[PDB]
Amino acid sequence: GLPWYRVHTVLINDPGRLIAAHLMHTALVAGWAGSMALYELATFDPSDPVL
């Protein structure tokens, strides 16, 4: 069987599922961005931009 460190090589000759993997990576990064902003907005104090 494939060793753990090679599981993603099953995509090397599978353009479609390579695209699917890339789409999922992009989904996760855009989601992170959205979640990070919402967290920051929930915690940000906007009342003193001087100090």
Binding site: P46, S47, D48, V50, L51
Partner: protein
């Protein structure tokens, strides 16, 4: 004109004070021997401004605009009182009664709700 309740109901006009033609720029003569009254005093707020808390370093607070959240429930009306003529010739209005208070909640930037008893009691 002479409107009726059924003309006004639900339109938001019941919260509006009456108005005068743009050409009513005359003069009401005050006869000192006479005694006077306000038969109807109407106050319609149009803006609510709240002084922001200037932080410890401060410098100066401003009055910041706010958003009304309690709808067309804000006006004071049917207020009555005597208009006295003082001996120095000034006039003084002394409120007796009326619908002279409305609870109002406005909202500041950031979401703080600020209630107030908009009033001219006494």
């Amino acid at each position: 004109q002479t409107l009726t309740y059924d003309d006004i109901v639900g339109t938001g006009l019941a919260n509006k004070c009456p108005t005068l033609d743009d050409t009513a720029r005359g003069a009401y003569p005050i006869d000192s021997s006479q005694t006077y009254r306000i038969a109807r005093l109407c106050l319609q707020p149009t803006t609510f401004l709240v002084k922001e808390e200037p932080k410890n370093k401060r410098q100066e607070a401003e009055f910041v605009p706010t958003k009304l959240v309690t709808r067309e429930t804000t006006s004071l009306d049917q207020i009555q009182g005597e208009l006295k003529v003082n001996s120095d010739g000034s006039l003084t209005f002394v409120e007796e009664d009326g619908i002279d208070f409305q609870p109002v909640t406005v909202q500041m930037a950031g979401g703080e709700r600020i209630p107030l008893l908009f009033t001219v009691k006494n």
